[PDB]
Enzyme design. Sequence first.
Site, short mmCIF file in Angstrom:
data_model
loop_
_atom_site.label_atom_id
_atom_site.label_comp_id
_atom_site.label_asym_id
_atom_site.label_seq_id
_atom_site.Cartn_x
_atom_site.Cartn_y
_atom_site.Cartn_z
N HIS A 61 28.89 -29.02 19.83
CA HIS A 61 28.33 -30.07 20.70
C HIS A 61 29.02 -31.41 20.46
O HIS A 61 29.02 -32.23 21.30
CB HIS A 61 26.85 -30.28 20.47
CG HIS A 61 26.03 -29.05 20.59
ND1 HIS A 61 25.78 -28.44 21.79
CD2 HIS A 61 25.35 -28.36 19.66
CE1 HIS A 61 25.01 -27.39 21.59
NE2 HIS A 61 24.73 -27.32 20.31
N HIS A 91 28.67 -39.12 14.21
CA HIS A 91 29.27 -38.27 15.23
C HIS A 91 29.48 -39.14 16.46
O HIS A 91 29.04 -40.29 16.49
CB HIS A 91 28.39 -37.07 15.58
CG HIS A 91 27.05 -37.47 16.13
ND1 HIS A 91 25.98 -37.77 15.32
CD2 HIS A 91 26.67 -37.75 17.40
CE1 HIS A 91 24.96 -38.16 16.07
NE2 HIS A 91 25.36 -38.17 17.34
N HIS A 93 29.75 -39.28 21.02
CA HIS A 93 29.60 -38.73 22.36
C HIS A 93 30.68 -39.37 23.23
O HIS A 93 30.92 -40.57 23.10
CB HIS A 93 28.22 -39.07 22.93
CG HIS A 93 27.07 -38.61 22.07
ND1 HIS A 93 26.50 -37.36 22.19
CD2 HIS A 93 26.48 -39.19 20.99
CE1 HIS A 93 25.52 -37.24 21.29
NE2 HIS A 93 25.51 -38.33 20.53
N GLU A 103 26.10 -42.82 25.79
CA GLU A 103 24.72 -42.43 26.07
C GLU A 103 23.89 -43.63 26.50
O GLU A 103 23.36 -43.65 27.62
CB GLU A 103 24.14 -41.72 24.85
CG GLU A 103 24.79 -40.35 24.76
CD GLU A 103 24.17 -39.39 23.78
OE1 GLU A 103 23.58 -39.75 22.74
OE2 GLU A 103 24.11 -38.23 24.22
N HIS A 116 27.40 -42.72 16.71
CA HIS A 116 26.07 -42.68 16.12
C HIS A 116 26.18 -42.48 14.62
O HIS A 116 26.60 -41.42 14.16
CB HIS A 116 25.23 -41.57 16.76
CG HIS A 116 24.90 -41.85 18.19
ND1 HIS A 116 24.48 -40.88 19.08
CD2 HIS A 116 24.90 -43.02 18.88
CE1 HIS A 116 24.25 -41.43 20.25
NE2 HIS A 116 24.49 -42.73 20.16
N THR A 195 19.01 -37.74 20.81
CA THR A 195 19.53 -37.52 22.17
C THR A 195 20.01 -36.10 22.39
O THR A 195 20.50 -35.80 23.49
CB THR A 195 20.68 -38.47 22.50
OG1 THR A 195 21.81 -38.16 21.67
CG2 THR A 195 20.26 -39.94 22.28
C1 LIG Z 1 24.23 -33.21 8.70
C2 LIG Z 1 22.78 -32.88 9.01
C3 LIG Z 1 22.00 -32.17 8.10
C4 LIG Z 1 20.68 -31.88 8.38
C5 LIG Z 1 19.84 -31.10 7.37
C6 LIG Z 1 20.10 -32.28 9.57
C7 LIG Z 1 20.86 -33.02 10.45
N1 LIG Z 1 20.28 -33.36 11.72
C8 LIG Z 1 20.68 -34.49 12.53
O1 LIG Z 1 21.48 -35.29 12.14
N2 LIG Z 1 19.99 -34.56 13.80
C9 LIG Z 1 20.32 -35.59 14.75
C10 LIG Z 1 20.42 -35.17 16.07
C11 LIG Z 1 20.77 -36.09 17.06
C12 LIG Z 1 21.04 -37.40 16.69
S1 LIG Z 1 21.52 -38.67 17.87
N3 LIG Z 1 22.59 -38.04 18.93
O2 LIG Z 1 20.24 -39.15 18.66
O3 LIG Z 1 22.23 -39.85 17.01
C13 LIG Z 1 20.95 -37.80 15.36
C14 LIG Z 1 20.61 -36.89 14.38
C15 LIG Z 1 22.20 -33.28 10.21
ZN LIG Z 2 24.36 -38.85 18.93
#
Ligand SMILES: Cc1cc(C)cc(NC(=O)Nc2ccc(S(N)(=O)=O)cc2)c1
Ligand SMILES: [Zn+2]
EC number: 4.2.1.1
Length: 257
Positions: A61, A91, A93, A103, A116, A195
């Site tokens: 993703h 990460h 987008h 986003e 992010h 998101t």
């Molecule tokens: C590296 C890691 C390890 C673990 C146990 C969980 C996670 N989860 C995570 O980072 N979820 C997450 C999903 C979407 C966003 S966003 N796109 O809104 O910034 C942020 C964190 C990530």
């Molecule tokens: Zn994100």
Amino acid sequence: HWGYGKHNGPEHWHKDFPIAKGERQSPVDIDTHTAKYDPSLKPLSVSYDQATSLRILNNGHSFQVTFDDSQDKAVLKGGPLDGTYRLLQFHFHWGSLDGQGSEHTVDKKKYAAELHLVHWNTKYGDVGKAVQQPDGLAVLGIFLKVGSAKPGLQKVVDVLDSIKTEGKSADFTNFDPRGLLPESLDYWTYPGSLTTPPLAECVTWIVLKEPISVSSEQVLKFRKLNFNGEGEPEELMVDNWRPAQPLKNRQIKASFK
Ligand SMILES: Cc1cc(C)cc(NC(=O)Nc2ccc(S(N)(=O)=O)cc2)c1
Ligand SMILES: [Zn+2]
């Protein structure tokens, strides 16, 4: 499973994740004339001097750089936040074209990409618990526009060939995320969500006013990543963004005038 295509993209997510239609979903459009300056917002405290990067991963993703979050090494504090939030991962987008990819939007303007930096509230002990809490995560969002190169991004760009396909990872130690920040820490803030599925309503969003500039060659290398795994036909990883969601009963606050 969910994704960003016609048949599994953001318009479909609510069927598996009904909170997609919830009361504090992200991203949103930041209407700059409607956001209100809040003089009681403190400056952000971004303490990344001791950041310990681990591995970079293509999860199908996005790509993600992970950090050691078993101690207070890279933390976000202050701003709208109470308590200490540890950096877990960052990460991006991004788009297929330079006029789309972010986003959040600013007065309906889309940026080429959005960074992010994901942090979780240490009072909840682990990120899985934090995601179940309304104040569990703080994500620092930074816009990318195409122009001059961002030197602090180049080590990320350099390694993307080695994680081209879903499931690949590489050892990404000694990366300094301070090289991804703009000069100003002026920000907008609002309560929101992840998101991506599960779209949990656990995030204090902190979106920086000042974009960073990246070069066309840098963002072009994002667009050469693959959604597919190795040994599958190529599907370019582009347009991995969720569009703006209804603001509903929320006010976006500005740390600046
Ligand atoms: C590296 C890691 C390890 C673990 C146990 C969980 C996670 N989860 C995570 O980072 N979820 C997450 C999903 C979407 C966003 S966003 N796109 O809104 O910034 C942020 C964190 C990530
Ligand atoms: Zn994100």
